[PDB]
Short mmCIF file of C-alpha atoms and ligand atoms in Angstrom, two decimals:
data_model
loop_
_atom_site.label_atom_id
_atom_site.label_comp_id
_atom_site.label_asym_id
_atom_site.label_seq_id
_atom_site.Cartn_x
_atom_site.Cartn_y
_atom_site.Cartn_z
CA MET A 52 407.72 131.54 107.65
CA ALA A 53 411.45 131.56 108.47
CA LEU A 54 411.57 135.12 109.72
CA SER A 55 408.59 134.14 111.73
CA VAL A 56 411.09 131.76 113.19
CA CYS A 57 414.16 133.78 114.13
CA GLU A 58 412.17 136.42 116.00
CA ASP A 59 408.66 134.96 116.23
CA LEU A 60 409.67 131.32 116.81
CA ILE A 61 412.97 131.83 118.66
CA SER A 62 412.62 135.06 120.62
CA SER A 63 410.18 133.02 122.80
CA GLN A 64 412.52 129.97 123.18
CA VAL A 65 410.25 127.14 121.90
CA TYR A 66 411.45 123.65 122.89
CA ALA A 67 409.93 122.27 119.72
CA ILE A 68 407.88 123.26 116.74
CA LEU A 69 404.93 121.67 115.00
CA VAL A 70 404.20 122.23 111.31
CA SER A 71 401.23 121.51 109.04
CA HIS A 72 400.07 122.09 105.48
CA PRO A 73 398.34 125.43 104.86
CA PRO A 74 394.67 125.76 103.86
CA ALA A 75 395.74 127.06 100.44
CA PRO A 76 398.56 124.96 98.97
CA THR A 77 401.17 126.06 96.45
CA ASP A 78 403.53 123.54 94.81
CA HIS A 79 404.91 120.92 97.21
CA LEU A 80 406.88 120.58 100.47
CA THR A 81 405.79 123.91 101.96
CA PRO A 82 407.30 122.94 105.32
CA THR A 83 410.88 122.77 103.99
CA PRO A 84 412.21 125.97 105.61
CA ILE A 85 411.31 125.23 109.23
CA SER A 86 413.22 121.95 109.31
CA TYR A 87 416.26 123.92 108.21
CA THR A 88 415.59 126.89 110.49
CA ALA A 89 414.97 124.97 113.67
CA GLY A 90 417.69 122.61 112.53
CA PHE A 91 420.42 125.20 112.95
CA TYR A 92 419.70 125.21 116.67
CA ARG A 93 418.70 121.53 116.65
CA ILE A 94 415.20 122.44 117.82
CA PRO A 95 413.02 119.38 117.15
CA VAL A 96 410.33 119.83 114.51
CA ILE A 97 407.25 117.68 114.16
CA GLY A 98 405.18 117.76 111.00
CA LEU A 99 401.51 116.82 110.99
CA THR A 100 400.65 116.82 107.26
CA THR A 101 403.97 116.33 105.44
CA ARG A 102 403.92 112.85 104.02
CA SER B 256 392.49 117.91 114.65
CA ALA B 257 392.73 114.16 115.23
CA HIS B 258 396.50 114.30 114.78
CA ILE B 259 396.93 117.58 116.65
CA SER B 260 395.54 116.13 119.86
CA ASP B 261 397.67 113.04 119.45
CA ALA B 262 400.88 114.79 118.36
CA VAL B 263 400.68 117.17 121.29
CA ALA B 264 399.94 114.21 123.55
CA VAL B 265 403.10 112.54 122.28
CA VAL B 266 405.05 115.78 122.67
CA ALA B 267 403.87 116.04 126.25
CA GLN B 268 404.86 112.44 127.00
CA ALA B 269 408.18 113.05 125.32
CA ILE B 270 408.89 116.21 127.33
CA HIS B 271 407.82 114.73 130.66
CA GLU B 272 410.03 111.77 129.81
CA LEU B 273 412.74 114.24 128.79
CA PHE B 274 412.93 116.34 131.92
CA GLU B 275 413.60 113.11 133.79
CA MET B 276 416.97 113.78 132.14
CA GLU B 277 419.41 116.36 133.57
CA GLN B 278 421.79 119.33 133.21
CA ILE B 279 420.11 121.05 130.26
CA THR B 280 421.00 124.55 129.03
CA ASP B 281 418.21 126.82 127.78
CA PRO B 282 418.11 127.43 124.02
CA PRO B 283 419.76 130.61 122.72
CA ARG B 284 417.76 133.76 123.44
CA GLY B 285 417.04 135.37 120.11
CA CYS B 286 418.90 134.80 116.86
CA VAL B 287 421.01 137.91 117.35
CA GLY B 288 424.47 137.53 118.83
CA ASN B 289 424.66 133.73 118.94
CA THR B 290 426.96 131.95 116.51
CA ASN B 291 427.01 128.84 118.64
CA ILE B 292 424.88 125.71 118.64
CA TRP B 293 422.78 124.56 121.59
CA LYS B 294 424.09 121.53 123.47
CA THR B 295 420.55 120.77 124.63
CA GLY B 296 418.16 119.54 121.92
CA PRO B 297 419.54 116.41 120.23
CA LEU B 298 418.60 114.64 123.45
CA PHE B 299 415.05 115.97 123.25
CA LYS B 300 414.93 114.32 119.83
CA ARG B 301 416.28 111.04 121.30
CA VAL B 302 413.67 110.77 124.05
CA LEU B 303 410.94 112.02 121.73
CA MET B 304 411.72 109.29 119.16
CA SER B 305 411.62 106.67 121.94
CA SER B 306 408.31 107.90 123.40
CA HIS C 27 426.85 151.14 80.86
CA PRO C 28 427.36 147.41 80.31
CA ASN C 29 428.57 145.85 83.57
CA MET C 30 427.16 143.04 85.72
CA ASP C 31 426.11 143.77 89.30
CA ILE C 32 427.82 141.57 91.92
CA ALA C 33 428.19 141.35 95.71
CA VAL C 34 430.56 139.54 98.09
CA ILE C 35 430.52 139.27 101.89
CA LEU C 36 433.06 138.29 104.52
CA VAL C 37 432.26 137.24 108.08
CA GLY C 38 433.93 136.33 111.36
CA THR C 39 437.28 137.39 112.83
CA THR C 40 439.23 137.22 109.55
CA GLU C 41 439.59 140.46 107.58
CA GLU C 42 439.89 140.68 103.79
CA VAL C 43 440.92 144.34 103.66
CA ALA C 44 443.46 145.14 100.95
CA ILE C 45 443.35 141.61 99.52
CA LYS C 46 439.80 142.21 98.23
CA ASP C 47 440.96 145.52 96.73
CA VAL C 48 443.86 143.69 95.05
CA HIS C 49 441.39 141.16 93.66
CA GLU C 50 439.34 144.04 92.23
CA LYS C 51 442.54 145.47 90.77
CA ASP C 52 443.31 141.90 89.72
CA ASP C 53 439.66 141.42 88.70
CA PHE C 54 439.40 144.02 85.97
CA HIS C 55 441.59 141.67 83.90
CA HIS C 56 440.36 141.21 80.31
CA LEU C 57 436.63 141.07 79.52
CA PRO C 58 433.81 142.93 77.73
CA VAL C 59 431.40 142.95 80.63
CA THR C 60 432.82 144.49 83.79
CA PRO C 61 431.98 143.37 87.31
CA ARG C 62 430.43 146.01 89.56
CA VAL C 63 431.10 145.05 93.14
CA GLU C 64 429.66 146.10 96.45
CA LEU C 65 431.40 144.73 99.52
CA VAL C 66 429.92 144.39 102.98
CA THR C 67 431.27 142.47 105.96
CA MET C 68 429.64 141.39 109.14
CA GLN C 69 431.32 140.90 112.46
CA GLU C 70 428.44 138.62 113.38
CA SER C 71 426.57 136.17 111.14
CA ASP C 72 423.09 134.89 112.02
CA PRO C 73 420.20 133.12 110.28
CA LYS C 74 418.12 136.26 110.82
CA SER C 75 421.14 138.58 110.34
CA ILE C 76 422.53 136.82 107.24
CA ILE C 77 419.06 136.47 105.71
CA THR C 78 418.38 140.17 106.40
CA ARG C 79 421.64 141.64 105.11
CA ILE C 80 421.84 140.08 101.65
CA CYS C 81 418.27 141.11 100.69
CA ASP C 82 418.86 144.56 102.22
CA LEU C 83 421.88 144.62 99.92
CA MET C 84 419.50 143.56 97.15
CA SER C 85 417.66 146.84 97.62
CA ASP C 86 420.63 149.03 96.69
CA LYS C 87 423.05 146.72 94.84
CA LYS C 88 420.42 144.79 92.85
CA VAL C 89 423.27 142.32 92.21
CA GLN C 90 422.90 139.29 89.91
CA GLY C 91 425.35 137.18 91.92
CA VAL C 92 426.67 136.70 95.46
CA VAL C 93 429.71 135.18 97.10
CA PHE C 94 429.65 134.38 100.81
CA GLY C 95 432.63 133.78 103.03
CA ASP C 96 433.07 133.16 106.70
CA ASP C 97 435.59 132.66 109.48
CA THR C 98 433.13 130.20 110.97
CA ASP C 99 433.21 126.46 111.61
CA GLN C 100 429.40 126.08 111.45
CA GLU C 101 427.79 123.73 108.89
CA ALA C 102 424.18 125.01 109.06
CA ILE C 103 424.84 128.38 107.40
CA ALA C 104 425.26 126.76 103.97
CA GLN C 105 421.87 125.03 104.30
CA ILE C 106 420.17 128.35 105.14
CA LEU C 107 421.81 129.75 102.01
CA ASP C 108 420.42 126.85 99.96
CA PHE C 109 417.00 127.89 101.23
CA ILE C 110 417.79 131.45 100.13
CA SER C 111 418.74 130.22 96.66
CA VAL C 112 415.35 128.56 96.59
CA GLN C 113 413.80 131.83 97.77
CA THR C 114 415.40 134.38 95.39
CA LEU C 115 416.80 132.37 92.43
CA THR C 116 420.06 134.39 92.40
CA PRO C 117 423.35 132.50 92.14
CA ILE C 118 425.35 132.23 95.35
CA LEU C 119 428.58 130.44 96.05
CA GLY C 120 431.13 130.32 98.81
CA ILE C 121 434.89 130.10 99.07
CA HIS C 122 435.62 129.21 102.70
CA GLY C 123 434.29 127.83 105.97
CA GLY C 124 430.68 126.79 106.42
CA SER C 125 429.60 127.63 102.87
CA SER C 126 432.44 125.40 101.82
CA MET C 127 431.30 122.43 103.97
CA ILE C 128 429.67 119.30 102.39
CA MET C 129 425.87 119.62 102.10
CA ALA C 130 422.71 117.71 101.11
CA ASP C 131 422.51 117.04 97.36
CA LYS C 132 421.24 120.28 95.97
CA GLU C 133 417.61 120.42 95.07
CA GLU C 134 417.61 120.81 91.30
CA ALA C 135 415.56 123.98 91.40
CA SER C 136 417.99 125.58 93.83
CA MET C 137 421.08 127.18 92.33
CA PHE C 138 424.18 127.02 94.43
CA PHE C 139 427.95 126.67 94.46
CA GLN C 140 430.10 125.73 97.45
CA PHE C 141 433.75 124.70 97.72
CA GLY C 142 433.11 121.35 99.40
CA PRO C 143 434.50 117.99 98.30
CA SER C 144 431.93 115.34 97.39
CA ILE C 145 431.63 112.25 99.60
CA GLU C 146 432.07 110.02 96.55
CA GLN C 147 435.16 111.97 95.48
CA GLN C 148 436.66 111.64 98.97
CA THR D 297 433.14 133.48 82.55
CA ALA D 298 429.49 132.87 83.18
CA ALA D 299 429.02 136.42 82.04
CA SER D 300 431.34 135.73 79.10
CA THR D 301 428.88 133.09 78.07
CA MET D 302 426.04 135.54 78.57
CA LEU D 303 427.79 137.42 75.82
CA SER D 304 428.16 134.32 73.57
CA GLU D 305 425.01 132.15 74.10
CA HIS D 306 422.24 134.77 73.77
CA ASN D 307 423.75 138.32 73.75
CA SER D 308 421.50 139.02 76.76
CA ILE D 309 422.09 140.87 80.04
CA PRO D 310 421.96 138.51 83.08
CA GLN D 311 421.02 141.40 85.40
CA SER D 312 417.79 140.85 87.35
CA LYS D 313 415.78 142.45 90.15
CA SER D 314 417.21 141.19 93.42
CA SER D 315 414.35 141.77 95.89
CA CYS D 316 412.81 138.77 97.65
CA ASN D 317 409.84 140.78 98.94
CA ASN D 318 409.02 141.91 95.41
CA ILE D 319 407.47 139.33 93.09
CA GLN D 320 410.17 137.25 91.42
CA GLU D 321 410.96 138.44 87.92
CA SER D 322 409.43 136.30 85.21
CA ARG D 323 412.68 136.57 83.24
CA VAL D 324 414.46 135.13 86.27
CA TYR D 325 413.23 131.96 84.81
CA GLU D 326 415.63 132.26 81.95
CA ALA D 327 418.49 132.12 84.41
CA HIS D 328 417.83 128.37 84.56
CA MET D 329 419.38 127.91 81.15
CA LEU D 330 422.04 130.33 82.41
CA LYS D 331 423.01 127.77 85.05
CA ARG D 332 424.76 125.54 82.50
CA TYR D 333 427.10 128.39 81.56
CA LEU D 334 427.42 128.91 85.29
CA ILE D 335 428.26 125.25 85.73
CA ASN D 336 430.83 125.45 82.94
CA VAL D 337 433.08 128.06 84.53
CA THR D 338 436.85 128.18 84.08
CA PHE D 339 439.60 130.76 84.48
CA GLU D 340 443.39 130.85 84.54
CA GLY D 341 443.29 127.60 82.54
CA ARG D 342 441.91 126.10 85.76
CA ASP D 343 438.59 124.37 86.27
CA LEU D 344 435.99 125.61 88.69
CA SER D 345 433.72 123.11 86.97
C1 LIG E 1 388.20 114.72 113.20
O1 LIG E 1 388.83 114.77 114.47
C2 LIG E 1 387.97 115.30 115.48
C3 LIG E 1 388.75 115.47 116.78
O2 LIG E 1 389.44 114.26 117.09
C4 LIG E 1 386.79 114.35 115.68
O3 LIG E 1 385.88 114.92 116.63
C5 LIG E 1 385.69 113.98 117.70
O4 LIG E 1 384.85 112.89 117.32
C6 LIG E 1 384.78 111.89 118.34
C7 LIG E 1 384.00 110.69 117.82
O5 LIG E 1 384.24 109.56 118.67
C8 LIG E 1 384.12 112.48 119.58
O6 LIG E 1 384.11 111.50 120.62
C9 LIG E 1 384.85 113.72 120.06
O7 LIG E 1 384.08 114.37 121.08
C10 LIG E 1 385.09 114.69 118.90
N1 LIG E 1 385.96 115.77 119.33
C11 LIG E 1 387.07 115.53 120.03
C12 LIG E 1 387.67 114.16 119.85
O8 LIG E 1 387.57 116.36 120.76
C13 LIG E 1 386.05 114.11 114.36
O9 LIG E 1 385.10 113.06 114.53
C14 LIG E 1 387.03 113.74 113.25
N2 LIG E 1 386.34 113.72 111.97
C15 LIG E 1 385.79 112.61 111.50
C16 LIG E 1 385.03 112.76 110.22
O10 LIG E 1 385.90 111.54 112.07
C1 LIG E 2 432.71 124.33 78.41
O1 LIG E 2 432.79 125.39 77.46
C2 LIG E 2 433.86 125.19 76.53
C3 LIG E 2 434.00 126.41 75.64
O2 LIG E 2 432.70 126.87 75.26
C4 LIG E 2 433.59 123.93 75.71
O3 LIG E 2 434.70 123.69 74.83
C5 LIG E 2 434.21 123.61 73.48
O4 LIG E 2 433.51 122.39 73.24
C6 LIG E 2 432.91 122.38 71.94
C7 LIG E 2 432.04 121.13 71.80
O5 LIG E 2 430.87 121.44 71.04
C8 LIG E 2 433.99 122.42 70.87
O6 LIG E 2 433.38 122.48 69.58
C9 LIG E 2 434.90 123.63 71.07
O7 LIG E 2 436.03 123.52 70.20
C10 LIG E 2 435.38 123.73 72.51
N1 LIG E 2 436.07 124.99 72.72
C11 LIG E 2 435.96 125.99 71.85
C12 LIG E 2 434.56 126.48 71.60
O8 LIG E 2 436.93 126.48 71.30
C13 LIG E 2 433.38 122.72 76.61
O9 LIG E 2 432.90 121.62 75.82
C14 LIG E 2 432.37 123.03 77.71
N2 LIG E 2 432.33 121.94 78.66
C15 LIG E 2 431.27 121.16 78.79
C16 LIG E 2 430.02 121.65 78.11
O10 LIG E 2 431.30 120.11 79.42
#
């Protein structure tokens, strides 16, 4: 998920990222890393399913 | 799916409202070699929150 | 025989050099368990680079603790490291720079030490 | 000093497999109790607490 961000989600220069809960869920707050990862570059993140 | 369509709609409105703004630097190309933040981006958040 | 495995890293323009060696000389001190140290430095620190290097170092060092240090003025690096603590459950702390800066109250599960004064304390 | 308390509290080696890619060691769990010793760290008559 985060490594998918530095090369996968940042090599391409996204202006923003969307994030949603996975089909199979483990524990809670799965979309913690992205908010941090995009956050370093201040890339806006929008969650769909994270209440 | 219901949120996806809407979230992306909002993102689109936010961006189109955003580019009305000016003098924006592209985000850093790739993680490698950049220790510096991106001046552009906080602003994207500001317009996007006020969509 | 009976020594703990440890790693420390320095980043940015500043160079530790001989001082680190002196600390090791200073470090033997008095103790029953001895520290085993592997040192690596990186001219450049990145979320992908930093994330990559410490785990890569995990492969050979298999260290039970890490200290991070930087020449940098960037706040975000410490947060990434908090994520890493969450990811690997290995203690990490930092003595300078970004790792030192004040950060969000540590998630209880995460393990982490930074040399940053608390807002309340200030 | 954390290691000093590894000697005192449980006589147990703190050493653990470091790889993120590999499944986290079950005995990594124990480190949680280890954190208190970690929290209570002092040297040179000076508190790192
Ligand atoms: C889940 O969301 C999808 C997509 O919004 C819904 O599918 C739409 O249903 C409306 C009903 O008015 C149709 O007009 C659309 O043609 C459908 N697809 C779209 C909007 O592209 C679906 O109904 C939703 N699920 C439930 C149970 O309501
Ligand atoms: C940090 O550790 C030190 C040493 O283990 C603790 O100091 C001891 O506290 C106990 C209280 O049960 C006393 O009985 C000992 O006399 C103290 N020193 C010794 C063992 O000689 C100290 O309390 C710890 N700090 C904490 C837990 O806040």
